[PDB]
Write an enzyme that holds these catalytic residues in place. Sequence first.
Site, PDB file in Angstrom:
ATOM      1  N   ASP A 266      -1.499   5.608  -5.293  1.00 14.03           N
ATOM      2  CA  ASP A 266      -2.025   4.776  -4.207  1.00 14.03           C
ATOM      3  C   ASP A 266      -2.279   3.343  -4.689  1.00 14.03           C
ATOM      4  O   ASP A 266      -3.340   3.043  -5.243  1.00 14.03           O
ATOM      5  CB  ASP A 266      -3.300   5.424  -3.660  1.00 14.03           C
ATOM      6  CG  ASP A 266      -3.835   4.743  -2.412  1.00 14.03           C
ATOM      7  OD1 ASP A 266      -3.288   3.695  -1.979  1.00 14.03           O
ATOM      8  OD2 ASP A 266      -4.804   5.286  -1.845  1.00 14.03           O
TER       9      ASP A 266
ATOM     10  N   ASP B 125       0.827  -1.215   0.000  1.00 17.64           N
ATOM     11  CA  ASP B 125       0.000   0.000   0.000  1.00 17.64           C
ATOM     12  C   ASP B 125       0.862   1.265   0.000  1.00 17.64           C
ATOM     13  O   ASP B 125       1.319   1.715   1.060  1.00 17.64           O
ATOM     14  CB  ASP B 125      -0.958  -0.009   1.203  1.00 17.64           C
ATOM     15  CG  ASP B 125      -1.854   1.231   1.251  1.00 17.64           C
ATOM     16  OD1 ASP B 125      -2.009   1.872   0.202  1.00 17.64           O
ATOM     17  OD2 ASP B 125      -2.391   1.575   2.334  1.00 17.64           O
TER      18      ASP B 125
HETATM   19  C1  LIG Z   1      -4.187   5.949   6.606  1.00 17.94           C
HETATM   20  C2  LIG Z   1      -4.205   7.317   6.022  1.00 17.94           C
HETATM   21  C3  LIG Z   1      -2.814   7.747   5.655  1.00 17.94           C
HETATM   22  C4  LIG Z   1      -5.191   7.458   4.848  1.00 17.94           C
HETATM   23  C5  LIG Z   1      -6.489   7.894   5.076  1.00 17.94           C
HETATM   24  C6  LIG Z   1      -7.375   8.043   4.024  1.00 17.94           C
HETATM   25  C7  LIG Z   1      -6.970   7.764   2.729  1.00 17.94           C
HETATM   26  C8  LIG Z   1      -5.673   7.335   2.471  1.00 17.94           C
HETATM   27  C9  LIG Z   1      -5.223   7.042   1.056  1.00 17.94           C
HETATM   28  N1  LIG Z   1      -4.906   5.628   0.809  1.00 17.94           N
HETATM   29  C10 LIG Z   1      -5.981   4.708   1.244  1.00 17.94           C
HETATM   30  C11 LIG Z   1      -5.349   3.311   1.304  1.00 17.94           C
HETATM   31  O1  LIG Z   1      -4.276   3.315   2.245  1.00 17.94           O
HETATM   32  C12 LIG Z   1      -6.341   2.226   1.698  1.00 17.94           C
HETATM   33  C13 LIG Z   1      -5.633   0.899   1.976  1.00 17.94           C
HETATM   34  C14 LIG Z   1      -6.659  -0.216   2.229  1.00 17.94           C
HETATM   35  C15 LIG Z   1      -7.229  -0.098   3.641  1.00 17.94           C
HETATM   36  C16 LIG Z   1      -6.080  -1.622   1.952  1.00 17.94           C
HETATM   37  C17 LIG Z   1      -7.014  -2.791   2.256  1.00 17.94           C
HETATM   38  C18 LIG Z   1      -8.338  -2.767   1.486  1.00 17.94           C
HETATM   39  C19 LIG Z   1      -8.228  -2.515  -0.038  1.00 17.94           C
HETATM   40  C20 LIG Z   1      -9.645  -2.256  -0.656  1.00 17.94           C
HETATM   41  N2  LIG Z   1      -9.664  -2.094  -2.156  1.00 17.94           N
HETATM   42  C21 LIG Z   1      -9.434  -3.294  -3.025  1.00 17.94           C
HETATM   43  C22 LIG Z   1      -9.578  -4.599  -2.251  1.00 17.94           C
HETATM   44  C23 LIG Z   1      -8.108  -3.170  -3.775  1.00 17.94           C
HETATM   45  C24 LIG Z   1      -7.831  -4.005  -4.851  1.00 17.94           C
HETATM   46  C25 LIG Z   1      -6.635  -3.896  -5.545  1.00 17.94           C
HETATM   47  C26 LIG Z   1      -5.700  -2.954  -5.168  1.00 17.94           C
HETATM   48  C27 LIG Z   1      -5.960  -2.120  -4.097  1.00 17.94           C
HETATM   49  C28 LIG Z   1      -7.148  -2.234  -3.396  1.00 17.94           C
HETATM   50  C29 LIG Z   1      -9.986  -0.884  -2.707  1.00 17.94           C
HETATM   51  O2  LIG Z   1     -10.022  -0.775  -3.909  1.00 17.94           O
HETATM   52  C30 LIG Z   1     -10.202   0.373  -1.893  1.00 17.94           C
HETATM   53  C31 LIG Z   1      -9.325   0.829  -0.911  1.00 17.94           C
HETATM   54  C32 LIG Z   1      -9.542   2.054  -0.291  1.00 17.94           C
HETATM   55  C33 LIG Z   1     -10.621   2.845  -0.670  1.00 17.94           C
HETATM   56  C34 LIG Z   1     -11.471   2.420  -1.682  1.00 17.94           C
HETATM   57  C35 LIG Z   1     -12.561   3.286  -2.136  1.00 17.94           C
HETATM   58  N3  LIG Z   1     -13.204   3.265  -3.261  1.00 17.94           N
HETATM   59  C36 LIG Z   1     -14.079   4.331  -3.212  1.00 17.94           C
HETATM   60  C37 LIG Z   1     -13.913   4.985  -2.062  1.00 17.94           C
HETATM   61  O3  LIG Z   1     -12.921   4.351  -1.358  1.00 17.94           O
HETATM   62  C38 LIG Z   1     -11.238   1.203  -2.316  1.00 17.94           C
HETATM   63  C39 LIG Z   1      -8.615   2.455   0.790  1.00 17.94           C
HETATM   64  O4  LIG Z   1      -8.980   3.187   1.706  1.00 17.94           O
HETATM   65  N4  LIG Z   1      -7.364   2.004   0.678  1.00 17.94           N
HETATM   66  C40 LIG Z   1      -4.796   7.197   3.542  1.00 17.94           C
END
Ligand SMILES: CC(C)c1cccc(CNC[C@@H](O)[C@@H]2C[C@H](C)CCCCCN([C@H](C)c3ccccc3)C(=O)c3cc(cc(-c4ncco4)c3)C(=O)N2)c1
EC number: 3.4.23.46
Length: 377
Positions: free
Chosen positions: A220, A35
Amino acid sequence: SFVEMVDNLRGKSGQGYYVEMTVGSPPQTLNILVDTGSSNFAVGAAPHPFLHRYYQRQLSSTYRDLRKGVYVPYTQGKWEGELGTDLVSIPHGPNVTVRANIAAITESDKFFINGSNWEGILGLAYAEIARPDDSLEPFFDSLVKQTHVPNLFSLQLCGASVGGSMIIGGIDHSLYTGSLWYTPIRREWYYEVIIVRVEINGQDLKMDCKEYNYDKSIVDSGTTNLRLPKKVFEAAVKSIKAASSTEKFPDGFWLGEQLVCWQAGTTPWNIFPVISLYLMGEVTNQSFRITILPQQYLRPVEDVATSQDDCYKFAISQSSTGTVMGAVIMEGFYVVFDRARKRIGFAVSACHVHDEFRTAAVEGPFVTLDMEDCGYN
Ligand SMILES: CC(C)c1cccc(CNC[C@@H](O)[C@@H]2C[C@H](C)CCCCCN([C@H](C)c3ccccc3)C(=O)c3cc(cc(-c4ncco4)c3)C(=O)N2)c1
């Protein structure tokens, strides 16, 4: 020695890219989602219906309790846990062992994913966004400080189950074609970049370029979609709708709520446009572009029926926290996170998706005046 790290990423389609790691002594093997959108290293450390294994601190002789709690709220999903340190290795990475901060996840909410095959998360961004605060050293910072691994990594995400490579400490030239084009890391917190122009099928969106980065633009790997600020999203969807007006889609499709299906092998790829994002370059008044194919922002899904129809979800969605260049963007490219030189490189990936007549591209140089005005303040 990078050949050992080629193909070290796995995953199921739409469930997250992960790398194998070991924590503790004796080593406990866990699959860890990679990530670049966060900065905490965290692992399941208690039973969960979706977890088939988890970190057992009691079984590790090198575990050290930090006697401090931690919680991380993401855009989607959150967890809380207990901080500590332990020895960590990457079997298909460099042959080193580092003592790293580890968040032992004890409770979570819509974080773990059933069937994903990963049990933790590797936040590869900078300390400034680490929880609880920037004094919790992120994994990659520990790696660089404790070993001779150079301060950079590269990611090749190969979409559909899924695979790819995380090259730790360098660039593997066999993983891309053409030239690498670099954009500055604007500020070391997220991997923040500056988008200076957007085109759809070669047509400029002609917005104030600040709109593209309101209030930031990040790279990201922990997010699927290309997420766009409201104003940009509406303009992009309006343009994508117009190019595909040949056919009809429910409005929920454009919200990512409904699927669209076509008879196997008859998907009308030609009516969906390419999107070009122009990024700030390395020299004055110079940019470059990366071009995205519809095969990247139309994600294949499982046909809910008993048919062999090709069904897809629209993977461009609206954001209120700035542009997110997620897996939709990254899957077409070899992306170099050159932390040492505060820049991110893009090149055409060797595992790019093939369209019959169009090709994803990284092209330059372009001249763009006043690129600094595109950053939001
Ligand atoms: C912690 C702090 C620094 C912070 C706060 C807010 C935002 C951020 C910016 N990065 C967020 C990530 O770290 C954050 C990491 C995440 C928990 C990893 C586990 C789950 C992955 C889910 N998944 C799938 C399974 C996937 C598949 C392939 C590759 C990747 C992911 C997504 O696609 C997805 C992820 C996030 C948000 C959305 C979303 N779709 C519309 C609105 O939301 C979708 C998220 O939140 N992913 C950071």
